[PDB]
Design a protein around this ligand. Structure first.
Ligand code: K37
Ligand code: K37
Lengths: 325, 325
């Protein structure tokens, strides 16, 4: 498999663009930034709102829990290539604890409103708008040869008042290389594309669209996560129970990929579930023919069938938002 | 039915934008333009290359065969609204024979190469490129609330050397009005969308995409016309024999449209014909998974399922052309 778009970005760019292991970090002053209050935390870092001692501007300090120098160079190089692009979290500085080497990435500040409390307030248009904004981030990084590999609400910071959105956490992000096999233990479970659940290692930008699709199904259907699987195997089961297994079968055959006997019998056989069957009084006003049509073109077993970010932005669903533009 | 996009363009614009009957033509000097040589001719006009006596710049003089003042105002008003837009034939002046009222529309000159001789020379990329260019014309007029209703090679002037393309002949063009029934005797037969063949009068911009789809199938498969039907009825037969009749059935049912018993039994029952079954040594190099995928998304019975012009431009098929941009 090869990405249907932006497949040669890296092959035509200077090696120093993608050769992240060959990055020599320019550490700044661990001082210019003061932690003001812990505002978040993944298992790969603790996050705090912070102040830039110099200009007093707010900032976000991401202190990294012991990371292999090679992975940090990846996240850093990726942040550097995408810095300036639409809705990409701006990396303002890299610093380190003098005494112990602990890295902290300094980013632009985003007065974010956690999704668990923001999404239920979102109007039909709001969702359309924000998803749209997220699509600019995605189409942009994809156009730079980068797979985020970790799309999800948690990684989409949103300032509702300013309507400013930023795709964050490029720690699981990777450069796309035509015909390269990648680890399928990326992205959060509930957003893991089928290809990740069936060890189809030669994936691409499309991985993200599925993630987005999951995030979108969650927002319109008000069901977060949309595919709540306790474990990777069960994750493929929550999917098959929605997309149907015959679709899965076609996917598996097209890419000559087998399934492990155990999971195989666990995913059993399920008929495709109409998207409208997820509709209820609570989300009826967010569901629409276009929302369904857009979502249907996102959640495709075949990563090759999924809408590319650029195509998603032109789907009529986004027409009103584009018109405001 | 209502267009999935640009549906409210006219409803939000000043009435003088679409009220073409209320146009008061500003006739110029029938003199400034001299016919140099007949270069074309439809049944609604004779076309000649011409010279602008003033600046000596070449021009195209379209002398209209007796037209109802109401239709001329339509073509003229439409040409005026779209003048300046991407690849839209530029209307430079409207004049009239003093002695007899015969109208002549003066347009920009295009050193065109008839398609019957140009297309066979076109490379894979050339086709992609030109179709792309045509899509800008289409997405633009559609975004102004106008249905061309007559897309076809004959109406796409092309200067291969300059790679300049213009969508011409807006004589069958009309303003789009949400929920309005239009005459289905528009566009040339071989490019008539199914909706035109089954009297689905509430069509929209999508009509054009089918036309384009036909033109595209002709160019990649080297089969002009692609759907060669001797008459409107037989036109729906050449289609059903390709898209299959069950698809047709779904279309007919969704829009509660019956078929006339006569044609009904004439279209009989046919299975869908894989697009790749139109491939042969002569067009093999122009056919590709993306070309097929793009075409498949154009030739849909359901005008609502067809790619909108804006969506077609973002289809991976056009990726290389967009990259050159
Ligand atoms: C889970 S709470 C949280 N808020 C964040 C903001 Br605002 C930014 Br900007 C960045 Br970078 C990260 Br990482 C964040 N993590
Ligand atoms: C069929 S030959 C022909 N060539 C044309 C050119 Br060049 C232009 Br510009 C326009 Br407007 C029209 Br109508 C044309 N008709």
């Amino acid at each position: 498999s090869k990405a249907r778009v932006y497949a040669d970005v890296n092959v035509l760019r200077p090696k120093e663009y993608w050769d992240y292991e060959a990055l020599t970090v320019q550490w700044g002053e661990q001082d210019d930034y003061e932690v003001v209050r812990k505002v978040g935390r993944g298992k790969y870092s603790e996050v705090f709102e912070g102040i830039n001692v110099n200009n007093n501007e707010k900032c976000i300090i991401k202190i990294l829990k012991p990371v292999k120098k090679k992975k940090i160079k990846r996240e850093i190089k990726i942040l550097q290539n995408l810095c300036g692009g639409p809705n990409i979290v701006k990396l303002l500085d890299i610093v380190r604890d003098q005494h112990s080497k602990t890295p902290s990435l300094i980013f632009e500040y985003v007065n974010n409103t956690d999704f668990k409390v923001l999404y239920p307030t979102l109007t039909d248009y709001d969702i359309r708008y924000y998803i749209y904004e997220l699509l600019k981030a995605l189409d942009y990084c994809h156009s730079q040869g980068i797979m985020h590999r970790d799309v999800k609400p948690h990684n989409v910071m949103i300032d509702h008042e300013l309507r400013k959105l930023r795709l964050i956490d490029w720690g699981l992000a990777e450069f796309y290389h035509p015909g390269k096999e990648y680890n399928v233990r990326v992205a959060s479970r509930y957003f893991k594309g089928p290809e990740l659940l069936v060890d189809l290692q030669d994936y691409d930008y499309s991985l993200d669209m599925w993630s987005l699709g999951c995030m979108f199904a969650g927002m319109i259907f008000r069901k977060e996560p949309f595919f709540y699987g306790h474990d990777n195997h069960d994750q493929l089961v929550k999917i098959a129970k929605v997309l149907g297994t015959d679709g899965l079968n076609v996917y598996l055959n097209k890419y000559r990929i087998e399934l492990d006997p155990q999971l195989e019998a666990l995913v059993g056989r399920h008929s495709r579930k109409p998207w409208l069957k997820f509709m209820n009084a609570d989300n009826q006003h967010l569901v629409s023919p276009e929302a369904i049509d857009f979502l249907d073109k996102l959640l495709r077993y075949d990563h090759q069938e999924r809408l590319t970010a650029l195509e998603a932005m032109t789907h009529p669903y986004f027409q009103q938002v584009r018109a405001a533009e």
